[PDB]
């Protein structure tokens, strides 16, 4: 075990910030849910560039107050949930949020959630993509339900912390 | 996994579907529902577009929200789905306000052409006499052929079509009422798609009878413009512009479904559901039965007694004819029996029962079911070949037959009338129990010998009068 990464999971509630953790560590997803009551803690290991990286996921809420596992996170993923735009559109909110109680220098990506809604989607992957690379965000689509992109959202994440490489 | 699981498999049907959107307390279940109806056959859900729009309105946000970009979608690809769609929802209103509104803005020359006849059957009041307002009718209708096409449709129809002529000299009024229901034939060019096709040109124009059904569309087609056209066909509604149908809506759902289940099981009970059309909580449409009149009417012509007439219609005891006729008759009368009974219909008599062509009978007047507050009269037995009878003895078989079956799906049959309950001024929906004495008369507790006793005791009562 290389290296420890602590990673938070952030957005509203309801959003799958929950799910996409079940599936990421333990490939498991729930159609019925328990609200997340404060933090909930899970854990996997990966190698990038030939390194072993244990990462800490934190599953937060949307309660308000779960501000304090934020700070001395290296990565966060954000999420939205791709069918419900009201979730899209708190995203901003959610960046001013890590811009008040966590690192300035923290990796951050967008998650559009639960992809396989492809009838119900409220928010277009360009329109999202967009305020992406117009912010300092990097960006991905998943289905938590059917594991789409659920590996590569952690996998990018995980790669580019890896690059902050110091000399 | 394990609920996904279910809706995974092939159990999973738009019948199902409902039921968890119905009853679904996990928003993320009802927002995954809401996206898996774009995969069912439009048919099957169409079935219950009465509950899913009523649910809309009734339901948390979240279940509207789930099922709302389905209807749109469905509403974007049809303007009869549209039309069916906004009629609903405003009849089911008295949160519908605001989809309504959307769906309504392009309808206008059908809103207009369903406008005016109504318009028609309002005016028809102030005649006190059938005779006389029946004529007003014919008069009236004649003005319709003015516009003589144009851009509208009886969503009635079994299929896409356009309005062509209405032959207004066929027209008749069904009552003395204040407030008559009035029967019309209309002609009707099919089409492939409605939504993609110009509307016909007119053709210029330059007497009726008690008659069947196929001898009316010859006299109708010949003396049609539009008659010699192989895509010319005839249709027919009864216009009631100020009675409710959303009960009978409702009936027609629970009929159409124990039709089903009797059909899936081997059960050869006959029912004949009666298209509905609701335009508001005060007015419809009924797409009629042809070839069938009023059993009361039936006495009052013939001056005979039920199975007289029959022998008379039909032939005497040894012709096929009567036979075949006797059997429709009996598995009419069985079916119609347990619709009665599980429905608990009531205000039955000979005015409210049809009689068709081929002999089965056919109930009509859905008031008064459930909550709001069928006999076997001696002149049926009789057609049945009497209490002894080998026939009337395979008519009480059939009602078990039909009852066993009735059970094995009954579910899908007590979803359909529990979901229309929702928010519901209905006069069925009175009591606070409606829903739950309904389930009782289902009987899943009892036996079959119980149910064979029960069959018995329900006969029994249908007879006392
Ligand atoms: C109570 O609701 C009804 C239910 C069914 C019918 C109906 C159907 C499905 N088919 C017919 C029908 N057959 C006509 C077919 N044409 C032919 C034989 O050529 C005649 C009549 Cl009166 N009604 N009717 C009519 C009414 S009603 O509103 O007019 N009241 C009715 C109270 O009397
Ligand atoms: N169709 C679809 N539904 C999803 C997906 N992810 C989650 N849902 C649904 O979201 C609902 C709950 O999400 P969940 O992830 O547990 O909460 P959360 O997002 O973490 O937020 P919280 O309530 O705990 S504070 C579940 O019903 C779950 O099935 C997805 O990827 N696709």
Redesign the pocket.
């Given at each position: 075990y290389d290296y420890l990464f602590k990673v938070v999971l952030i957005?509203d509630?309801?959003?799958?910030?929950?799910?996409?953790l079940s599936r990421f560590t333990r490939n498991e997803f729930?159609?019925?849910?328990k609200?997340?009551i404060g933090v909930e803690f899970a854990t996997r290991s990966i190698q990038v560039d030939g390194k072993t990286i244990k990462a800490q996921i934190w599953?937060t809420?949307?309660r308000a107050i779960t501000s304090a596992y934020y700070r001395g996170a290296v990565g966060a993923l954000l999420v939205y949930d791709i069918a419900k735009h009201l979730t899209y559109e708190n995203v901003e909110r959610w960046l001013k949020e890590l811009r008040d109680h966590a690192d300035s220098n923290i990796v951050i990506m967008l998650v559009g959630?639960?992809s396989?809604?492809r009838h119900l989607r409220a928010v277009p992957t360009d329109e999202a993509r967009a305020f992406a690379e117009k912010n300092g965000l990097s960006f991905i689509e998943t289905?938590?339900?059917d594991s789409t992109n659920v590996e590569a959202a952690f996998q990018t994440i995980l790669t580019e912390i890896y690059r902050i490489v110091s000399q | 996994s394990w609920l996904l699981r279910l809706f995974e498999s092939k159990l999973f049907d738009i019948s199902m579907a409902i039921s968890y959107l119905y009853n679904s307390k996990?928003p993320?279940?009802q927002?995954?529902i809401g996206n898996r109806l774009f995969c069912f056959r439009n048919e099957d859900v169409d079935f219950y577009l009465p509950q899913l729009l009523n649910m809309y309105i009734h339901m948390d946000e979240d279940v509207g929200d789930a099922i709302k970009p389905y209807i749109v979608h469905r509403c974007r690809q049809s303007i009869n789905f549209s039309l069916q769609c906004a009629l609903l929802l405003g009849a089911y209103s008295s949160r519908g306000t605001k989809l309504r509104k959307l769906i309504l803005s392009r309808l206008a020359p059908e809103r207009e052409f369903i406008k005016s006849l109504m318009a028609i059957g309002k005016r028809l009041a102030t005649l006190p006499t059938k005779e006389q307002k029946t004529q007003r009718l014919i008069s009236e209708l004649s003005l319709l052929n003015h516009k003589l096409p144009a851009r509208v449709w009886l969503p009635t129809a079994g299929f896409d079509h356009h309005v062509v002529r209405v032959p207004h000299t066929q027209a008749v009024v069904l009552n003395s009422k204040d407030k008559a229901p009035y029967l019309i034939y209309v002609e009707v060019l099919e089409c492939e798609n409605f939504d993609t096709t110009s509307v016909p040109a007119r053709i210029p124009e330059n007497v009726a009878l008690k008659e069947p059904w196929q001898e009316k569309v010859r006299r109708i087609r010949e003396g049609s413009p539009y008659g010699h056209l192989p895509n010319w066909r005839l249709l027919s509604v009864i216009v009631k512009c100020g009675d409710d149908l959303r009960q009978e809506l409702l009936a027609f759902q629970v009929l159409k479904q124990l039709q089903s289940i009797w059909e899936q099981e081997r059960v050869p009970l006959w029912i004949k559901p009666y298209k509905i059309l609701v335009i508001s909580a005060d007015s419809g449409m009924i797409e009629p039965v042809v070839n069938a009149v009023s059993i009361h009417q039936v006495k009052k012509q013939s001056q005979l007694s039920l199975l007289d007439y029959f022998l008379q219609e039909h032939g005497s005891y040894t012709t096929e004819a009567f036979l075949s006729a006797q059997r429709n008759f009996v598995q009419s009368c069985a079916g119609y029996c347990l619709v009665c009974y599980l429905l608990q219909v009531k205000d039955r008599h000979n005015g409210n029962i049809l009689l068709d062509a081929e002999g089965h009978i056919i109930h009509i007047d859905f008031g008064f079911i459930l909550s709001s507050s069928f006999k076997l009269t001696t002149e049926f037995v009789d057609v049945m070949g009497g209490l002894d009878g080998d026939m009337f003895n395979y008519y009480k078989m059939l009602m078990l037959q039909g009852l066993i079956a009735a059970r094995k799906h009954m579910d899908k049959v007590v979803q359909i009338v529990e979901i229309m309950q929702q928010g519901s001024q209905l006069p069925c929906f009175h009591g606070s129990s409606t829903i739950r004495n309904l389930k009782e008369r289902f009987h899943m507790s009892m036996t079959e010998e119980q149910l064979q006793l029960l069959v018995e005791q329900m006969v029994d009562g249908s007879m006392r009068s």
């Open positions: 957005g509630s309801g959003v799958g910030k929950s799910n996409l729930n159609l019925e849910s609200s997340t599953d809420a949307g959630n639960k396989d809604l289905s938590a339900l | 996990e993320g279940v927002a995954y």
